[PDB]
Design an enzyme around this catalytic site. Structure first.
Site, PDB file in Angstrom:
ATOM      1  N   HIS A  91     -14.614   1.424  -6.913  1.00 16.65           N
ATOM      2  CA  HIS A  91     -13.262   1.295  -6.393  1.00 16.65           C
ATOM      3  C   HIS A  91     -13.013   0.119  -5.462  1.00 16.65           C
ATOM      4  CE1 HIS A  91      -9.225   2.496  -5.727  1.00 16.65           C
ATOM      5  NE2 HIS A  91      -9.399   2.799  -4.453  1.00 16.65           N
TER       6      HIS A  91
ATOM      7  N   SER B  24      -5.207   0.597  -5.003  1.00  9.24           N
ATOM      8  CA  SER B  24      -5.117   2.058  -4.856  1.00  9.24           C
ATOM      9  C   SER B  24      -3.676   2.522  -4.913  1.00  9.24           C
ATOM     10  CB  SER B  24      -5.714   2.523  -3.520  1.00  9.24           C
ATOM     11  OG  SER B  24      -7.128   2.483  -3.523  1.00  9.24           O
ATOM     12  N   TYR B  25      -3.230   3.164  -3.836  1.00 12.26           N
ATOM     13  CA  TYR B  25      -1.862   3.649  -3.739  1.00 12.26           C
ATOM     14  C   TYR B  25      -1.001   2.399  -3.844  1.00 12.26           C
ATOM     15  CZ  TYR B  25       1.614   7.162  -2.384  1.00 12.26           C
ATOM     16  OH  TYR B  25       2.652   8.058  -2.352  1.00 12.26           O
TER      17      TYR B  25
ATOM     18  N   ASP C 250     -15.537   3.219 -11.286  1.00 15.29           N
ATOM     19  CA  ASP C 250     -14.737   3.727 -10.188  1.00 15.29           C
ATOM     20  C   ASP C 250     -14.750   5.258 -10.137  1.00 15.29           C
ATOM     21  OD1 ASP C 250     -12.728   4.367  -8.307  1.00 15.29           O
ATOM     22  OD2 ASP C 250     -11.779   2.416  -8.694  1.00 15.29           O
TER      23      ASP C 250
ATOM     24  N   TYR D 141       0.916  -1.132   0.000  1.00 17.79           N
ATOM     25  CA  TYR D 141       0.000   0.000   0.000  1.00 17.79           C
ATOM     26  C   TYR D 141       0.953   1.178   0.000  1.00 17.79           C
ATOM     27  CZ  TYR D 141      -3.634   3.293   0.740  1.00 17.79           C
ATOM     28  OH  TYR D 141      -4.493   4.350   0.547  1.00 17.79           O
TER      29      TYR D 141
END
Ligand SMILES: *[C@@H]1O[C@H](CO)[C@@H](O)[C@H](O)[C@H]1NC(C)=O
Ligand SMILES: *[C@@H]1O[C@H](CO)[C@@H](O)[C@H](O)[C@H]1NC(C)=O
Ligand SMILES: *[C@@H]1O[C@H](CO)[C@@H](O)[C@H](O)[C@H]1NC(C)=O
Ligand SMILES: *[C@@H]1O[C@H](CO)[C@@H](O)[C@H](O)[C@H]1NC(C)=O
Ligand SMILES: *[C@@H]1O[C@H](CO)[C@@H](O)[C@H](O)[C@H]1NC(C)=O
Ligand SMILES: *[C@@H]1O[C@H](CO)[C@@H](O)[C@H](O)[C@H]1NC(C)=O
Ligand SMILES: *[C@@H]1O[C@H](CO)[C@@H](O)[C@H](O)[C@H]1NC(C)=O
Ligand SMILES: *[C@@H]1O[C@H](CO)[C@@H](O)[C@H](O)[C@H]1NC(C)=O
Ligand SMILES: *[C@@H]1O[C@H](CO)[C@@H](O)[C@H](O)[C@H]1NC(C)=O
Ligand SMILES: *[C@@H]1O[C@H](CO)[C@@H](O)[C@H](O)[C@H]1NC(C)=O
Lengths: 729, 729
Positions: free
Chosen positions: B703, B593-594, B671, B510
């Site tokens: 998402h 995500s990240y 998303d 992450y």
């Protein structure tokens, strides 16, 4: 064999190019040809030429010219540049006219930028172009233009140009302009898509665009509100700078105005007689109107008694739309290819006043198209020779005696040439023959008077020499019988084919209505690499719904898309798997568009015949596709028509049957034709029933996924897939 | 060992479930709880109970009740149905108030359908709800409500509710209305997104939708126009006495009004004192205003003598935003967590009219949060215990003597409980402790008078029993040292792990700012299976930029996203390789995500360390992500700020390097957070450089790709990929 095979890289890089010979007849004795890069003019009778324009004449033009177009009289040239593509035929560009006499490019009264279409008059050098959905005419390249229309309005009113559905399904062109023979009148259509829903989708553009843009295109899906159409004719010889031009409208027939309908063909018969064909939304009824110009009234009148009805009781009318008529010199009669009593498409002779046409050809084979007409002969192409639907030759029939038919290409070179297309000079004094298979393409010039062979324009000797250093695959065209009927297939066989061995097989499929994947055409493609390098047999089958074999076969799938055409491919595979050289444990299937549809319907059929399949931009549910094409075969998706079948021929309903096959679904996000929506729904259905599958989307690519990079990437990806699917464990 | 292993179906089908114990304190003595389907009320002090509402009451309600809510005075219950999700916290629904006493359902002056938000007042049974972007109030559940605003307007003006970016990045909530302590006043925020660009994307919906819908959301990307905000307060007590109660505005401080800013915290101190915290678009400077009601002017004043400033010279302010203040009953002073002189976040004591606070805790560890404040004690959670950043415990400090600090959770069960959470009763008389690791979750009740354990509410005996017959993996939580700094990591090691063998390693990543992948929480996820069945070591590492360890580490990435956090993950892999029990040839990486962004960045660095990686819903170019979050760490994408690093930290500019790894790209099409555009631009860059990779899109999934079917489908797909990449002949 130490020779290199035909690899994926050769296909992707065009290592082996087929030489062509694109010419343009500018008269009955000459034609233009793009040599090195400059333009030359040829005398068909001798073969000698002269430069018509030096490839350097525009060295300092300060723009890359996309294409050119000489005025009919050879006086001017329209240089096209600033090319920007839209759909399959449409696009915009900037134009500049260069006077060939004064050898200087006109810099006064120039065609606007972002012109949607332009066209010279048939004779002389007048100009008609469409800008911001409006029509303009220029009697002289350096003189101001007359604005013929004022109702033009982006995505609403189209004048002289087609909307999305008309361009793709009706006219296969963006042009909705039709000059009269000597260029006196300018006939044009007008489309109104006011109430036509908009398909909407995202375009991401270059990575620098922070917010993706939403593309909105008026696109009528099955059963939606279609665009409306009007026809008009204006006299360009009587235009003034003072008052505005006056366009005379020619309203459709009453049998058409009682409901939705389409304009499907416009054809001038003479200088004052224009014929038009209209088609009902329910595409099994069309009518031809013949309109004469009333020199006195100044209006156009189409006498009822001159109306010609064309309809089918077994399917839609025509192959994809009612055929074009070919009028005689005086315009009093004409020949038109129509389906006959037995359902085979032949040439019928029509008198504009009499209602019964006469067939001048017959038999269990069809006339592909009428190519030329003189007072003595009518030249056409058909698949009569050796009774092979996949072959094509140039024939001519004596108009005074139909019993006398002469093939002009059949015996030229039977082993190498079985599929021709032709190109006649202005008065049919000469004709170019283009052979495209089974062997390498061959182009030749001939004279009509004695049908003598003048010379060879291009024989592809070069390509032939290099191909000799390669282990090129072969092609097998043949047939199997099903219920007394004969259906043809072709197989691309790997080099050194051995019938004692067992090869995996990839069924290349399309099978759309009136399609033909089994012919004698020579092709260098993906299948070529798969057979030459991967030793994979690539087959194709033309089952029910296929064309050029009469309506009993073609109409077999009327109002029933997703049935017989899908069954026949399965049955085709089923039979190939029973052949000695096929490994029934390794049989795949793939298609693009309709083929994607069929490929998917086949994989979800539960037959167990296929191990894996690849579907590129498939149609998944007909209510998602366009009206003109879908309704033609399916009718309307209403309860009182054919809604039930619309709902039973979807890919989605078969999701679970995918549990035992490896599926690869690919689609471009910017596909304006078969919307990504169709693939998104296929995937969601598989996810819904828990079926794993392979997928690949292409950002900003459309239905052809043809950009250089995307093209190489998709074929590379599919190749990895098919290879993995056929990997002997 | 013949015991079964924890399998993929085990994870996907929820075979082994973690019992929970969710209670809702309705007072300082009792809480509500659902035994079966009926709601029970428990006496905390003795653990005895009774049915507050039996599962038979709403059988003929004709609606599925999604959730319920009891009015502070326990006289009414707000029933929620017709629930339709929107973003992470927002949604609409229908409601029906039930009169607990008269045991009857109200049918008069009902809350409208499609209500965006509804809440009771802190005391009594007043109601406040947002409908069509306007605020309404009901003094009595059966009486007509008053309209507080008339400016509401879909996607433009939001009163009482947040816009997309405020909901997700600023308030982590959809509502923006704050009742005063005794409910007299109602305060709210107003957002204007008039000039905020819209993100647009298709939503296909069910197969029956002919034309896909275009979802449009006001969403400000990096450097785009942000929504403006305004604050107001209305005296709900004057409504019945006035025709149109006037909303008084409390303008932001001049130091904020000079440029773009945000309202980032609203907290009432007393019945006539409210505190506001504003944050400049350049999130390294916030101001707190403490405003008091002036009874003789009906206005709200904020004395500068009470204005408190909170900036940062090494990064942004707060972990994600300035922390919430906790006022003592008299509202004359408050507690708040802020970074200290060493960069460690601790609790500071403030006197509302003094600009210098006193830290009441200190050391090299941090306070996670202030949980409760009484006249004598302040309870907080920190990670001080044993110096473990990934640990969490409840602490109590004596307001009268700060040297008096007791840990209430540290020793209760040290081996099994290191990560705690707490829930105090309405007046801190009782508190439920919630242990979530490293052992099975444990819920216990306690009494504050003597910190004695009342009883165990849930210990997960059943599960512990089940898990006994499974070869569960083990988790190692430790650290490695880089540049004299301690950097933690955790490893989900397979059963019977042997340091003599070499294991394939999957790096779970992450690494966003202030993140934490290494901790003491017990989990049953995809990793559990990868280690248990596939014998894969799933590791995670908190390098520079991670949280709860001081600003030296957290602010290391300040204005430089895509750098150290990326390298440190790579350096983490090497270190694990140095540990001798990792197959240097089978190292994979994956993140969401990240996580997806760092995975991609790492995969495109060319380190040659990772064999393959999976990126799900990744950020690819910071200019595509939202203002608040991005700008918080990257500043503005302008030439005179940080544009250069924006353009240099994208995944796309590393395309050519993905030729060295196997890549799987996955993204939901609907998303709204990390737009599909992000992955669309990645794929396009890869295609543009001839890189083959695997992709997967999930139609209409957002998402979280958390729909039941899509959840199983994606993990199933990722599982095949991992097992393929680690396949070893
Ligand atoms: C071909 O040669 C003839 C004379 O032999 C000449 O009249 C004619 O213009 C030539 N055609 C071209 C276009 O070179
Ligand atoms: C074209 O035909 C029209 C109508 O018959 C006639 O008036 C006009 O002069 C013709 N133009 C030429 C040069 O043939
Ligand atoms: C286009 O059609 C609409 C009806 O849908 C009509 O109102 C409008 O006038 C038409 N546009 C023109 C000017 O032809
Ligand atoms: C020309 O005619 C159009 C409609 O055909 C009208 O809108 C315009 O005002 C007229 N103006 C001129 C050029 O006389
Ligand atoms: C055209 O198709 C419709 C619908 O199937 C049918 O009812 C009609 O009779 C057809 N037209 C004719 C008479 O051929
Ligand atoms: C527990 O016992 C007390 C005794 O006073 C009783 O009042 C209370 O209602 C009981 N708890 C519940 C809510 O059943
Ligand atoms: C709430 O506070 C206001 C303002 O100080 C006060 O006037 C009012 O009486 C209080 N309400 C209650 C619960 O008594
Ligand atoms: C929202 O802002 C626009 C200008 O950005 C303004 O015209 C409008 O009045 C504002 N709406 C409010 C604050 O009610
Ligand atoms: C209440 O006051 C606001 C603000 O002055 C005004 O815009 C609104 O129209 C008023 N509503 C009524 C019921 O008069
Ligand atoms: C806030 O951030 C900007 C950008 O780095 C900086 O120039 C300014 O001096 C900072 N102010 C503080 C409080 O450090």
């Amino acid at each position: 064999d130490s020779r290199k095979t035909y690899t994926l890289t050769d296909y992707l890089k065009n290592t082996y190019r087929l030489k062509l010979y694109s010419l343009r007849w500018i008269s009955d004795h000459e034609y233009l040809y793009k040599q090195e890069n400059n333009i030359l003019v040829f005398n068909a009778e001798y073969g000698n030429s002269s430069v018509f324009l030096e490839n350097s004449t525009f060295d300092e033009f300060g723009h890359s010219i996309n294409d050119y177009s000489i005025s009919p009289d050879g006086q001017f040239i329209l240089l096209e540049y600033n090319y920007v593509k839209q759909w399959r035929h449409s696009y915009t560009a900037s134009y500049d006219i260069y006077d060939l006499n004064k050898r200087q490019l006109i810099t006064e009264e120039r065609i606007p930028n972002n012109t949607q279409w332009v066209t010279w008059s048939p004779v002389g050098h007048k100009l008609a172009y469409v800008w911001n959905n409006d029509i303009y005419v220029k009697i002289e390249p350096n003189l101001p233009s007359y604005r013929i229309t004022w109702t033009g309005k982006e995505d609403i009113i189209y004048n002289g140009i087609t909307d999305w559905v008309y361009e793709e399904e009706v006219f296969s062109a963006y042009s909705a302009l039709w000059w009269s023979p000597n260029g006196t009148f300018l006939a044009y259509a007008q489309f109104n898509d006011t109430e036509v829903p908009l398909i909407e989708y995202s375009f991401y553009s270059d990575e620098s665009l922070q917010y993706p843009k939403t593309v909105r295109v008026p696109y009528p899906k099955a059963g939606a509100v279609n665009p409306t159409v009007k026809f008009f004719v204006v006299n360009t010889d009587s235009l003034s700078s003072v008052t505005n031009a006056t366009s005379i409208q020619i309203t459709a027939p009453a049998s058409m105005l009682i409901g939705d309908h389409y304009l499907c063909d416009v054809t001038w018969a003479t200088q004052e007689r224009i014929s038009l064909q209209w088609l009902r939304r329910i595409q099994n009824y069309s009518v031809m109107d013949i309109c004469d110009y009333d020199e006195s009234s100044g209006r156009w009148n189409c006498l009822v008694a001159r109306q010609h009805i064309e309809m089918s009781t077994t399917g839609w009318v025509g192959r994809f739309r009612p055929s074009e008529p070919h009028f005689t010199l005086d315009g009093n009669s004409f020949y038109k290819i129509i389906s006959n009593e037995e359902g085979y498409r032949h040439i019928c002779y029509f008198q504009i006043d009499k209602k019964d046409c006469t067939f001048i050809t017959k038999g269990t084979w069809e006339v592909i198209g009428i190519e030329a007409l003189t007072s003595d002969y009518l030249y056409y192409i058909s698949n009569e020779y050796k009774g092979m639907p996949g072959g094509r030759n140039l024939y001519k029939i004596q108009l005074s005696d139909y019993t006398k038919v002469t093939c002009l290409s059949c015996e030229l070179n039977p082993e190498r040439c079985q599929y021709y297309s032709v190109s006649f000079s202005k008065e049919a004094k000469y004709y170019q023959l283009r052979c495209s298979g089974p062997g390498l393409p061959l182009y030749t010039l001939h004279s009509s008077v004695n049908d003598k062979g003048l010379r060879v324009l291009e024989d592809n000797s070069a390509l032939d020499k290099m191909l000799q250093n390669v282990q090129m695959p072969s092609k097998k065209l043949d047939f199997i019988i099903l219920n007394e009927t004969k259906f043809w297939y072709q197989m691309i066989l790997p080099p050194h084919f051995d019938k004692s061995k067992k090869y995996p097989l990839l069924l290349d499929v399309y099978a759309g209505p009136c399609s033909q994947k089994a012919d004698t055409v020579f092709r260098l493609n993906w299948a070529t690499y798969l057979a030459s390098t991967e030793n994979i047999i690539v087959a194709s089958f033309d089952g029910r719904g296929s064309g050029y074999q009469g309506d009993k076969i073609m109409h077999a799938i009327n109002r029933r898309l997703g049935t017989f055409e899908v069954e026949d491919q399965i049955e085709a595979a089923r039979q190939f798997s029973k052949m000695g050289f096929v490994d029934n444990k390794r049989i795949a299937i793939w298609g693009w568009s309709y083929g994607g549809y069929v490929t998917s319907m086949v994989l979800g059929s539960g037959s167990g015949v296929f191990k894996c399949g690849i579907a590129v931009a498939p149609v998944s549910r007909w209510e998602y596709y366009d009206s003109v094409y879908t309704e033609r075969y399916m009718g309307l998706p209403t309860p009182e028509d054919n809604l039930d079948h619309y709902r039973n021929s979807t890919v989605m309903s078969r999701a679970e049957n995918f549990k035992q096959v490896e599926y690869l679904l690919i689609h471009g996000t910017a596909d304006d034709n078969v919307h990504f929506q169709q693939s998104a729904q296929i995937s969601k259905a598989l996810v819904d029933v828990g079926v794993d599958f392979q997928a690949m989307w292409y950002t900003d690519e459309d239905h052809g996924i043809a950009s250089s990079t995307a093209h190489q990437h998709i074929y590379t990806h599919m190749s990895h897939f098919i290879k993995q699917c056929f990997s002997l464990p």
